[model samples]
Target: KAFDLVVIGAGSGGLEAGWNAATLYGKRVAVVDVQTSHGPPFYAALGGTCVNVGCVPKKLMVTGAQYMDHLRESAGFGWEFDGSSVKANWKKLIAAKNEAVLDINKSYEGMFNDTEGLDFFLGWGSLESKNVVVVRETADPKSAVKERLQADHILLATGSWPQMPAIPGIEHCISSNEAFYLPEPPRRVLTVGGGFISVEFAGIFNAYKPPGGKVTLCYRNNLILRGFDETIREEVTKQLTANGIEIMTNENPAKVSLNTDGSKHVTFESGKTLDVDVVMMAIGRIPRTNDLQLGNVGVKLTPKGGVQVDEFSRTNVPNIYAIGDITDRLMLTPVAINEGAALVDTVFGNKPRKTDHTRVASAVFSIPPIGTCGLIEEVAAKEFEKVAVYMSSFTPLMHNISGSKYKKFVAKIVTNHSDGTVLGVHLLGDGAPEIIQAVGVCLRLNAKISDFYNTIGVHPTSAEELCSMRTPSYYYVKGEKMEKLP
Candidate 1:
């Protein structure tokens, strides 16, 4: 059948664009979703990875694990608890998360059904030509009957998939997709990556492990989180180590071998080896474009496998577009949703909108958590003429009562020296993500140091520290050494 708009993937970006076009312009829209269940026991559903696997389930598990930690930490707060009473039930936790995801998936379908001129297809879709799309029940072409779809405009939002290394016996390793559906939490886990997924799962497993359980994070680089500020990276490393999560740097997995007892033996290039109950590969993710057949449509893709798109989410073909992880702009769910909105407005509403990615706030749900927005200190030092840095790392007030003095709250703000505009705001502590969101709004309005100073802060709160930071801890002039400000 012919459609005004055909979206290849029913992910965040595709769903937004499809629904917006149909609802706003009365255009006929069809979205094809091909994702299926893959984990040993979990049946993956709609709402994409954010709701099904990546964000929702991970965050739920993170919360579950955090509560486990809280129970232990509560001992110092004069809360008496029998250790046996606070143990986590893996089956119960996974079942609860799975049920929640299924509800969201069903909601998406119900919302689509309520929209006029919008249709959802449960199959794999790919470009056959500039305006023709061929879909099949499975991604494999040889498996099923093909259905041809014609569209005036097509959008590719196939999202991305995790990458496993080329090492021997790597098939045994699990990615974040499967991690959410593990039959039971492993007694010992060796996470093999330095990215967010690796760091997060490491923290979760460590906090939620059974008695005498162990979690180790091994990365080839000296530090995890390559794109974050150096100080933030260092602080997280310190915190992870302090929490008993072993951090192995400068080590690459060479191969994996299974022991007779069902444990995995992971060997490193540096001749080191680790035997663990689970081996998780969180190295990286690649765009999901292999089945799209973009070459036939003359749609270009970047070397990194992301669909090439213009500022307005338009591809080389005027009638074709791409968004979200497939476009590789910023793989965040909110970013994709924004792009989807922009694409719909530009295409149908006669309102041209380009996605603005600057000053976007994001969080890493690590053990301590991290929230950051705007530029990093290193980038600001080079980009701005004169940069001023204000930073504080101290034991949070909660630690005083909880008796977890080792837990520290770190906050940093970067400012433009000329106008004292807040260039960036970063925090690594409790509620950092929530706090950084408010800072994002201030940065969006170009709020200056004086603006922060004038605003009244909530007292006895960690967020208050940002407003009260009157002195610069470090000052830097372009092309000069960083100066310590007294």
Candidate 2:
């Protein structure tokens, strides 16, 4: 079928671009999605990895874990209840996650169904040439080539997949994708790796429990979150540890031997050992381009093995473009969504639009959660002539009366010393994720540290601390600390 544009993969980016292009720009668009039967072909609606697996489902469980914190802290507010009377139903949690995902998945379908000039397909699509795409019923390239889509422009929004490790008894371990389908919560959990998945999952296991099961996080590096702000990294590690999550650093699993008692006997390269009910490997993720025969159309890739695209989301091939995880850009859902909409404005409309990746807000939904925008202090100090760092770490007002030890709220702001331009904002504690989101707009508008001081804060809230902190915690010059600003 001939169309104005054909998009492969009906994920966040693909769907957003296709919807806008056809609805607003009056282009006939075909959106292709492969119906994957990961488990007996259960009805998985739409909306790609973020909705189906990555963000939506994971954040729901993180909220489930947060309830335990609230339940324990209720006593501080003069509410008395038996602690042991509380029980976490893991099955109900899973079902709730599934329900939310399915509902949103249907909404995506409704978008295409109601909109004119939009055609949606359930099949795996690969480029046959510069202007041609062949759709197969399944991932199999040879399934059927009967359906060939010819378009003026072809887009690749195929997302990424989790990277599995190669070690003894590796089959005993599970990735983030398979971790969602667990029927019952494990008695003991071991989340391996120091990155997002490892830390986040460990926090989930530590918090959500019928009886508060143990969670041990083993990482190959001494510190977790390798490239994040040092303060954010240190604070998250401390808070997680305080919540009874065992942090085993500088270690990796050498072998995973299943015990007859239904436990995992994991031995580390350093001769350390652990026994757990579940072992999740959160190593990293890889681009989903293996099946896409780009060579057939002479599309080049970056050194990172992702589609090499310019800031405008244009690939080496002019008629063909790529976005989202396939391009290995920001890899965040919102970033992908914006990239797609920008693609529409530039390609379909007369106006040229390019989505910039810099100064975007990102978050980690650990036990306490992390929200950050702009550059990290570590990098800003080196890039700018001088950088001033303002920081505050204190137990929340409720936590003070609650007598919670490590439920600390920490915030930091990095500003260019000469101009006082707010270069970065990092938060670790409750409401960090949502707070940083608004801060992202500030950073985009070049808001200075003075702007934070001028804006009156909403008192008696953790966020108010962000603007009230007038004194600088420290200053750095050429990556070296100089003096504090007061």
Candidate 3:
């Protein structure tokens, strides 16, 4: 009749919270998840959006797409192919990705099934009251089970969903949710947005699509990635353009029209039109809290529609807590996991904990991946009295064989001049994300410039460059540029 903890949404955050509460704190945890469906016959699996559509499947597709890039450069690497051409089987690729996703889904279900103190419920869960939740089986109606769950504590972890802008014929446009299960590879894909979703998907198409397969990126602003550093924006734009992605900057799609030949005709505000086989709207994502009936309870939401919670992951109502995308804090998986565990420690483990959002590293998986942590150059300059910027740009060894200068790597470090504290590290290259992860460890410990210098470099590796950068490419004092060293 009652549970120690009732968590809504079996996403990364919810799963982590439930897992910790049950295993560590010995609490009776019940997780109710609604099966996510974008359209007919495409249902998200048990592991929530990350496993079903977000990180896991997307990264698999990114790796799949990178194979073509490798084959294109194989000749330069002294590897010979028997035939003059190579092609990818779109059907086979999708099948493999789906297969792997299903396996992960089952594993997550297995965890809940085998755990002694955990119960997994498949249904649409909504807040009935302060400490009560009502669930209805929407996907499977044969049993048609409905029930109410009472818990001492409740957690709202429902993740976000892609938003569709209100444009003429907007129904014709698909979001990233639907883009994963497309029946076949589109010959021409038109992505409308400036966010990472649009940029990453566009890069995938540019890498793996059939020859002459066109990809266009339309954004209202010149920059594609808004929150990242300026260097990242410039390098990514250059790489995207070099790799044949048509970027239409300072343009917004006014309308979308369906052509008789089963293509999309997208017209921008500038009166320019583009004919493409598919159109994806990746402008933004909003919290998936609309159906949860939060108004019935006292759960407050932010102005942007995210669940409002304190640093301790507690809402206005003491018994109700929220995490993950629903809280709109970073919207990153690791952050959600951290928040979940921190919540468990605070509530069930008798230890007070809070999620530290600062000094976290993130990566954008695109044509050339991006990795960054701490602060951007602009923010670092503004925050500190004096900032020193050390930069290094080089053609990686792999690109040397391919003889493509476009495949370059950029590394920039921002440090506070007063204490030599490493403020930020931004990298763009093949293994930038992986490299930045190591740097994140240093930043997390508040490592200084001398700490980086004290570390020995691994010979002939891209990561070693981080330690080797000595001179400041640019120097600033109180946010003012200095022509020479002071």
Candidate 4:
């Protein structure tokens, strides 16, 4: 069969690309993916990674875990509920999350199937040549094998896969994918990564551990989130430590050994040993263009394993395009979808679109969620002329009665003094994600310092601190030492 466009992997990017090409551009588009069950124990084969292993699954777990933490607030909120009486069914939570993901996956499948002049291939597609794709079918009653499809343009939006490291006894360590559905609750978890996954998982395991279970998240550097604003990072670190999550920085794990006790003992190069029931590897994910045969088709990829694309998400070969994690632009689902939709304009419309990475809002679902947009403090101080910090870190009202294990939360606004425009907004707290969603819009329009102060406070709310960070804000002026603002 011949098509105007062929999209590999029916994920967010691929679906959007195919939809735009078929519906808007009046082009025949074909989307292919490995056939697997989209329901029950196997929600792996419907759409793509975000629907399978990445966002949807993780967010559900975060939501469930946050409710576990919220139970502590009952006494503080003047509602009496016994902590020992609280109960959570892991099987039920996982089942609910799995079901929701399956529903989304089926929706993606339906989107393609329902569209006119669009085709769906349920198989693993490999490049047979520059213009031809040979799909190898997996065993499915509905799927057929050995189909050949040719398209004028082949777009690779295959996102990414988890990178399981080569540490000794590493096979025992689970990636974020497997860690989500551990057969039993993690008795003791040692998450090894500096990224959001590790930090967030550590918080979850620590807060809701089984009986005597504890969590230790290890990173190779003193800084966990390097791309985040310095103030936000520092405040998060402080809060994380205070919350009783063991954090090891500036160290590398040398090896892991299984004790006779069925527990794993992780040995650090620093000559320290950590005993934990499970180890989670969230180091990162590489772009999923490896097996797609991009080289055979003259598509350029970066040394870091991401496809090299221009303003239009087109690979070195204009006939080919890439988006999502395959391009490794910003590793977020919304960013991937934007890149995919924009690629369609480049191909079929008079006006082509380029990806705008600036002011993109994101949140990490940690114990106290972390959210940010625009330049972080470090980047702003180095890249812009002048930087100011309107910051707050204090305990919330609920925490006052619950006896906050951590000091509170943090909110920092980095501004350019010359124009008084908010260059960066970072917050680490209970509802950072919800807060940053609104803050991101303002930052996109370059909101001024007055905007933050003028905003009326929502009385007795944790987020109110953000609106009322009066005269004691700090300033990091260019060429001057760090000091307080009057």
Candidate 5:
């Protein structure tokens, strides 16, 4: 039996592609996911990294942690509780995150079942022949692997997995995958990396196990979130450090050792040593194309192991296309959905759409949060005709009284002066996702800075700044000088 499309992996990309192709395009699609008795650590907690151990749960932890700082600063507002010092329960939060993830996984399963022309298989799958996929019932199942389906086009959407590096006693290190659900809470945790995941867990562990426990983040770079706006990046760095998150920049965890008490001792390049209850490697994630046997079909892969897909989201082997982390073209979940939808449109409908990679919104929920979209100021000035950066870095009105948690929001605009085309818009702040979501629509239509200012301000809110940044803080003229906007 033949199908219009065969999708590998039930992650965001595969599900989106299969759901859209089967429903919207009305194609015969088979979606396969390898179900394991013990769920993937990423899938076990909040859902995938974004919802489970990632954006949502991590932000929730950050929000709860912010309350601790607030308790100390609440004296200014004359608000005091008898037991002002309330400690965080790492176990409780982890449990809640686990529940949320279970709910999400079940929801995705339900969605596929509800959709027509979709068959869900739970097992390992590989390319049997070009356009033909054979699936094994389970990873270790001794049963014969059967040629489950054949299709005109096969879409691989398997996401990434975490790999621990080859450090001394590397066996003792845990990847972010296992960091979420350590049976017993880690008192002293050392995260090695300057990436988003490292900073997040570093802050998270410190927040949960405060006062007595210490969390150290060791990175080889001078700064974290390397690609974001420099000002915001610097400010965030200062803020995290000020909050007692021990940031060891320009340092690397050269080796890891297991202590007698089953703890870990991490040694840095500078000859400094740290003793921690757990060591997590947040180096980064790579595409999950290993088991798919792509080379057999001549499907190309990126240097980093991501499937090489073209502008139309079709892989080098035209019929075997890709979406999401497997393609390594925007690792975010929303971007994966867009790619999947576009792939569906190209295959099913006559839409002939290409996935747009530029100016898409992204957020890093690092304690205080950093949200961005389009070209950052650094990238914008060089890419557009005229660059106008309307930035506001201030303690929000709520913080004026609360005094504990405050965030600075930056908005940078890149425009083509010739046709007044707004090339990019980026922001870093608390209400960032909400603000950027709306601004994204306007930017898509080439709205000017004037359009934002004309909109009424939401009184005494972080988002109000979006409308109030009328008088530009800084502007740069193409081939001219950069100066403060008057």
Candidate 6:
């Protein structure tokens, strides 16, 4: 098979570039994906991880979990309901996620079918050369293949997979990959590591089931959300702990053994033991490049196991390119989609373009969630000569009636002291994800603290807190906090 372009991995970035390159630029493109056809598990659909496993399903689970709190909080608002009856059907939630994912996969397939120059295949892609990609039923060379496609260019957007350390009885533990397909809700969950997936799952398992279910979040480090702002870390830790998530710090699971009752008996490095129904390892993610035979094709990869790419998503080999999670770039879906757009222009439209990774906004869907953009206080202290930090931690007007125990929402702004230009906006609140988009636009335009103050906000709303907070909590001069508002 011959094509103008052969893109491996039909995930977010690959699908975007493949769809656009054929539809808009009229390039003959062939997009290949992996799957275990007529099988039980590990069937990667057309739309990839975000659609099938990571973002979409996780968000659905989180939303379902959030409703649990909403029901409990309703009693404070004089709403008459039986809080004792509220429960989460884990099976139904998984079904919903799978059904939604199927729709997305159908849409992707429909696009490829309708588009004139686009083609789609199901198999693993191995690089035979810079321009030749061979499809195999599995990564094994001896397995039957779908086809061997040749193209002018080959792009790798295979994305990443959940990684776990080789601890004894590791097979007894499940990673985020299998989390969506879990048969039923666990009565007790042991969420390992201290990252987005671990914390979010901890929040989900904590709130999703009936009362008396326990969720213990164990981290190798003392704190959760390692790269986030300290204020956010403190706030999230406090809120989640207050909401009944037991925090275990400086512990690594040494081994996991299944009990006779089908529960997991976890032995940590500290020789401490925990009995949980589920032990989820959200330790880390690594690039899914092993199947691509990248080294044989002469593509350079970073120490982080990502396909090393320059500013333009160009691989070391001229005709090959890499984007999204496969690269060391930001692993967000939006970034990958945009990167795909720019890539189409470069490879097909004969135009030069680049992505500026700075000033990107992201969200972590913890129970309350977090929306953050730009420099963190710790990093800003080092980068800027004089940095002004403004923080507002308050109870929302709704919480006055909702009477939630974990009632505080924090909004922090980092600004350049000399010029009054806003450097960052971080929020820990319900709806912070949606609220952060407005800040993304403001930050793009280099909006200042004065600009936020200048705008009039709606009265009696949570977001208005962002507009009204004017006073600085502290100042960082030469990388040291001044201790109080100026």
Alpha-carbon shift of residue 28 in model 1 (angstroms):
0.9
Compute each candidate's TM-score over C-alphas.
Answer: 0.96, 0.96, 0.96, 0.91, 0.90, 0.96
**lDDT for predicted candidate 4 compared with the true structure:** 0.78
lDDT of 5 by residue, 1-486 (tens): 779998887766677788788877779998776652124522522123455545555666667666666676676678767754576777888777767666777777677668788887766777767878878865433557855688898988777777677778888888877776776667888888877888878777777774588778887889877877778778778777877778888988889887899888888878998999988898878888877877778888888778888888877676888888887667888888888888898878889898788878877767567667677656666666566666666766666775545455565655554454566665666666666776667767778767777879878777777677665566766545367532
State how far residue 364 of model 6 sits from its true place (Å). 1.0
lDDT of 1 by residue, 266-372 (tens): 99999999999999999988888888888887898888778888899888898999998998767898898899999999988879999999999999999789999
CA lDDT, every model vs. true structure = 0.85, 0.84, 0.85, 0.78, 0.73, 0.85
Taking the tens digit of each residue's C-alpha lDDT, what string does model 2 give over 270-369? 9988899899989787778877889989889888889999888898898788989999868799999999999999998998899988889999998788
Look at candidate 3 and give me any clashing residue pairs.
Answer: none
lDDT of 3 by residue, 37-108 (tens): 222343444676787879888898989888877877777889888645677777787889888887787778
User: In candidate 3, residue 192 scores what lDDT?
Assistant: 88
Q: Candidate 4 — which residues are off by over 4 angstroms?
A: 36-44, 138-145, 405-407, 454-472, 484-486
Residue 458 displacement in candidate 4 (angstroms): 4.9
lDDT of 6 by residue, 149-183 (tens): 99898889898888988999899998887777778
Please report, as a residue range, the 10-residue window in candidate 4 with the lowest summed lDDT: 35-44
Give candidate 3 misplaced runs (Cα > 4 Å).
Answer: 36-43, 139-145, 483-486
lDDT accuracy of residue 121 in candidate 4:
83
Candidate 4 per-residue C-alpha lDDT over 1-486 given as tens digits, one digit per residue, 9 for 90 to 100: 899888887887887888888898899998888754443243345566777877778888887887766776666667776678776676777788778876776777677668897888877776767788777754332345478889788888878877877878888787777766766777788889889888877876765577776778889988887798776677778777876787889877788888999888898889998888898888888897756766666777888889898878877776888899888779888898898888889888887898898999999887778888888766787776567777787777567877665746788877886777888888888778888888878976668877778889898676676677645365655635376532
* lDDT of residue 448 for candidate 2: 89
Stretches of model 5 off by over 4 angstroms after superposition: 36-53, 56-78, 137-147, 405-411, 414-421, 475-481, 484-486
